[PDB]
Amino acid sequence: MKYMITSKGDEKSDLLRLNMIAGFGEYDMEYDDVEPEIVISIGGNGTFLSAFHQYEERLDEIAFIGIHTGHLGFYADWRPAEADKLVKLLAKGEYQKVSYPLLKTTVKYGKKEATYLALNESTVKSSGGPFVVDVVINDIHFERFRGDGLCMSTPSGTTAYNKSLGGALMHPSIEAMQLTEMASINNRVYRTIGSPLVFPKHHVVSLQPVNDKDFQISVDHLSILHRDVQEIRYEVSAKKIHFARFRSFPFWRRVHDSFIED
Amino acid sequence: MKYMITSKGDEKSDLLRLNMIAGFGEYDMEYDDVEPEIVISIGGNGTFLSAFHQYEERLDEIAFIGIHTGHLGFYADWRPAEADKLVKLLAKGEYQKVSYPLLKTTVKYGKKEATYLALNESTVKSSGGPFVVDVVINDIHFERFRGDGLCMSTPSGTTAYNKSLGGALMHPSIEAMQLTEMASINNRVYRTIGSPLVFPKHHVVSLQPVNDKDFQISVDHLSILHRDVQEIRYEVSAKKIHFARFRSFPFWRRVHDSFIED
Amino acid sequence: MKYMITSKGDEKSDLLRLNMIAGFGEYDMEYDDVEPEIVISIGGNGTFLSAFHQYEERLDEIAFIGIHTGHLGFYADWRPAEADKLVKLLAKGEYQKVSYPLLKTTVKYGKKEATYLALNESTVKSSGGPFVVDVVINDIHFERFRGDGLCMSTPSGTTAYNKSLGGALMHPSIEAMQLTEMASINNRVYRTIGSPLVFPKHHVVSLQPVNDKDFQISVDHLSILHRDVQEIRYEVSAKKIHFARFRSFPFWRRVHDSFIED
Amino acid sequence: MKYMITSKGDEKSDLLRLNMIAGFGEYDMEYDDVEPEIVISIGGNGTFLSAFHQYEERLDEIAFIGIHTGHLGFYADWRPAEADKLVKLLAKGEYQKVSYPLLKTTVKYGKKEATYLALNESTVKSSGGPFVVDVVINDIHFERFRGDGLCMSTPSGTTAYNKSLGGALMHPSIEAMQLTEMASINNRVYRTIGSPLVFPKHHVVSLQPVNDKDFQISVDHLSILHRDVQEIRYEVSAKKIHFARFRSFPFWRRVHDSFIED
Ligand SMILES: NC(=O)c1ccc[n+]([C@@H]2O[C@H](COP(=O)([O-])OP(=O)(O)OC[C@H]3O[C@@H](n4cnc5c(N)ncnc54)[C@H](O)[C@@H]3O)[C@@H](O)[C@H]2O)c1
Numbered sequence A, B, C, D: 001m002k003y004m005i006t007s008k009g010d011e012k013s014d015l016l017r018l019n020m021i022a023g024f025g026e027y028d029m030e031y032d033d034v035e036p037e038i039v040i041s042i043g044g045n046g047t048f049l050s051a052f053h054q055y056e057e058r059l060d061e062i063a064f065i066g067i068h069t070g071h072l073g074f075y076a077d078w079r080p081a082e083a084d085k086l087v088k089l090l091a092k093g094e095y096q097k098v099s100y101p102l103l104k105t106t107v108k109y110g111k112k113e114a115t116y117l118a119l120n121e122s123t124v125k126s127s128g129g130p131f132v133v134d135v136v137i138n139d140i141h142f143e144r145f146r147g148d149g150l151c152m153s154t155p156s157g158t159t160a161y162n163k164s165l166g167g168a169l170m171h172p173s174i175e176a177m178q179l180t181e182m183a184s185i186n187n188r189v190y191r192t193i194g195s196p197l198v199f200p201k202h203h204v205v206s207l208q209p210v211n212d213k214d215f216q217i218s219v220d221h222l223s224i225l226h227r228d229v230q231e232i233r234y235e236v237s238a239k240k241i242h243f244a245r246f247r248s249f250p251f252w253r254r255v256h257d258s259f260i261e262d
């Protein structure tokens, strides 16, 4: 099967990558970083995010696998010491496929609209400057949000920025996105919902400028200053990320291991 | 069609009930509180909850309709002044059916297990006394929770007790339950997740006593002191509540009307 | 100097107590549990709280010292292994005195008022039953609180129940009390401040029943069902607790050690 | 007495200013914006903040008075319609003076240190980029903070940015500053206190760079990108702001009026 390996680029990750390629050489099992069927990431959570975004135009043809050199593997299954076992398992085709939901972000201007795919989240802040937007859900005006910004998370994204903002952790079998507030202003004149909101597939959340059409918009690691924005639109993507697995490693066990104990 | 009406029991609600029965008399359209196909509640949110629990053994045969005399209609669609329009619409069969998910609670003892159905939530607190339970998700030990208690909410329940505890609001098309913490203790020795958790259908959350087997368990309005508890088990019910509707009144508009403005 | 020792009552604490008495026998240094100048607590945080409340009528004549057998010493300075060093230091008079603020609670009825002193906090919940009170600060109606209850904390109490409810941690040199909410209900009709409130000395916070005059009131470990309540009044006490110290052990280092690392 | 008036600069505020000057003309009562004893602000909360910072080098010689054209007067006492009554009261010397605490911020570089005074708060965020600082309190390493940033508030500042970040509201008679977290990262490897912290006078909170010495630092409305930072130091200022008052208008009533009702 066609595969490639991305490395964090430090000595540790590079050498692990070379050894895996050498091991894959004894199998069938072609290195191809143009049209891989398997993408292996070796590094931190950032390395995995880079791997995902490198191949976001062929997500339907790829199964992702992570080895984490950091603490701390939300998209890793594997430790550096387990690399030889993974080589043998991958070569044998000894795996099942699991899929997580993704978030579509559309930015409209005074055209051409830009579309982004997020594995963790997309956030919006001001470029300045007071942040004020109208929040429109399925064409109904829901609230005028004033504060620091807003975060829209995928289910797998809920353990990250979403969690820090008081959002719920959601099992990735649920096809949803979650909107959290950053430092909302609430007084007798200005009001927000002041709770995270969880949206199903096909629900559309639109942010519309009130002032003030410049925004700092993030998509996972990427952060861009967008000018002359008319709308930011959030919806669950029709696209999914696929993982190759190998052994049972339940989401809630992954949550336990990351936040409670070892 | 067979129907019944429950009233809050004050003069206002009783008279509205009598007038609706009188209006239903001009149609076809039989009063039957043993085997109703339509259950009409006139009162507050508590009146509606009582109506639901009065008929929880025939939820598959009933479509519920609420008129709210209070502020404040999370399960009401209707205002007292709209009662005549509702009579005509109901009599004509001019409605579509919408379903919300429900929460199953199982309490096991040193037998016979007790099972409860919740429309809003089920909560657990101590009878004393320090509250400490082991939280087990699909047979994996997730955390030892210390604090005031725990709340498990349906999607429609998320606007209630769940919201007050920092939980997310979830659209009821999502078949899920949400676990929130009450006053969790977190220090260098005791740790909880400290975020709400959202579980899909078929996931099972089990609370197991550590000490200390007596618990105050609530199911919607009902609150009971349970003794000699071995397990409390939470899962999304196979059963759903059905509503008769009539006109579009989106969940998010209902949320806006209840928390933001009019 | 006159002293006494309280023990948690397990074998470990009892034996440590006997050894300290034996060591104090070689000094001057009289055991007196009626009029002690020094009160030594050996046990958990609960043991220390019991020691404080045993002697709350002579707080001006006593300096408290704690040895913690638990994790986990918010009022302990000392570990069991350090007991011999403490014996020698105490006998020598080798200490400075530090004072923390306390909370006065007054419960008024349809007389005789009951007054309580808290080292950590006093809380109020319903006996049932919906909890609703009017919050009156220096005779001005501030809010109608609906929810689970309210917690009023001393500065040293802020690391306990207060912390779990989202309250700030306050240095005990600040003569204040802090009011936190438990599960406040906020919607378009019912509103609370939804933030902790910090009150200086001489400010008086009065809770007045709306319904519904029965309340479960806690003062540190003590929890009592109070009937026919007309008012609950909170204010910073004129009384303080005094500690004997011995070496510098800053409050913020104590916070670090308890919540961050070792 | 020497006075000046600042205006928001819209037609409404400008005309109110002209009328007050005309009214002050009938008294004694000299317009002097170099060395005023009374500074009158007409506009929003931003106008008042500008007035404060215009005269922060002569805070000991000035008593401030606000008229709010906005909603919404945390530093206003007065409404536009009350301007004539204020003219007469001011001219008569019919007032008492009230003082609130202020926050000193020191930014040290690889010299010359910059010092700022805040009436509401000072915040710190990254210029990029991951925000990571070591939090040092009175020379003791307290935590390594990872997240979006940190906010240090005065007592009067607690109703603003502090409130949005979950901070306590503190009565301004308390000489303190309060540190709140913005989106702190907490997992099994990274830990923060996860509660607001309230510091008395003379306590010093130092933020020290870990990476990564560029920071976006705000002081009230002012926001500056600081490069090559070695330390950010927070402490309660020896300086206070003085207000002229006129009638009793308690802080807690001001809080009620701003967040609860009218
Ligand atoms: N205050 C915050 O919680 C905060 C701020 C900015 C970004 N982030 C998160 O960091 C991610 C990447 O940011 P960056 O590349 O700029 O580096 P970064 O330094 O801002 O964040 C990297 C950290 O986030 C963790 N992380 C990445 N994905 C995660 C996941 N899904 N669940 C839990 N933790 C996860 C990594 O293990 C690492 O510790 C973003 O997608 C966002 O979720 C968090």
Ligand SMILES: NC(=O)c1ccc[n+]([C@@H]2O[C@H](COP(=O)([O-])OP(=O)(O)OC[C@H]3O[C@@H](n4cnc5c(N)ncnc54)[C@H](O)[C@@H]3O)[C@@H](O)[C@H]2O)c1
Pocket: B045, B046, B072, B074, B120, B121, B156, B157, B158, B159, B160, B161, B162, B164, B220, B221, C129, C130, C146, C147, C148, C182, C183, C184, C185
């Ligand atoms: N601190 C809290 O938020 C708190 C405490 C106890 C109970 N409750 C809620 O009250 C409900 C019934 O309690 P009770 O009968 O003892 O009376 P109650 O006085 O304790 O609560 C009644 C209030 O809850 C509101 N409510 C009911 N269902 C709701 C919904 N699904 N979404 C939003 N608000 C809703 C009603 O409008 C009413 O204002 C429970 O199911 C629980 O959700 C809330």
Ligand SMILES: NC(=O)c1ccc[n+]([C@@H]2O[C@H](COP(=O)([O-])OP(=O)(O)OC[C@H]3O[C@@H](n4cnc5c(N)ncnc54)[C@H](O)[C@@H]3O)[C@@H](O)[C@H]2O)c1
Pocket: B129, B130, B146, B147, B148, B182, B183, B184, B185, C045, C046, C072, C074, C120, C121, C156, C157, C158, C159, C160, C161, C162, C164, C220, C221
């Ligand atoms: N949900 C909660 O956070 C919760 C609930 C009830 C009581 N409490 C706290 O427990 C204290 C005593 O309760 P109890 O005797 O019923 O036993 P308990 O089991 O309810 O609580 C004992 C725990 O609280 C800790 N504790 C005591 N004083 C503390 C302090 N000032 N700062 C930080 N932690 C402290 C102890 O170390 C112990 O772990 C109360 O004064 C209250 O502060 C907390």
Ligand SMILES: NC(=O)c1ccc[n+]([C@@H]2O[C@H](COP(=O)([O-])OP(=O)(O)OC[C@H]3O[C@@H](n4cnc5c(N)ncnc54)[C@H](O)[C@@H]3O)[C@@H](O)[C@H]2O)c1
Pocket: A129, A130, A146, A147, A148, A182, A183, A184, A185, D045, D046, D072, D074, D120, D121, D156, D157, D158, D159, D160, D161, D162, D164, D220, D221
């Ligand atoms: N997310 C937030 O809560 C947020 C973000 C940035 C700034 N702020 C606050 O706004 C203030 C000034 O910001 P700006 O000039 O850039 O304009 P801005 O638009 O960012 O904020 C102005 C708003 O803050 C209110 N405000 C000012 N002082 C207040 C006080 N002490 N208590 C309660 N509300 C107060 C004003 O009434 C106005 O509604 C800052 O000092 C900060 O406290 C808040």
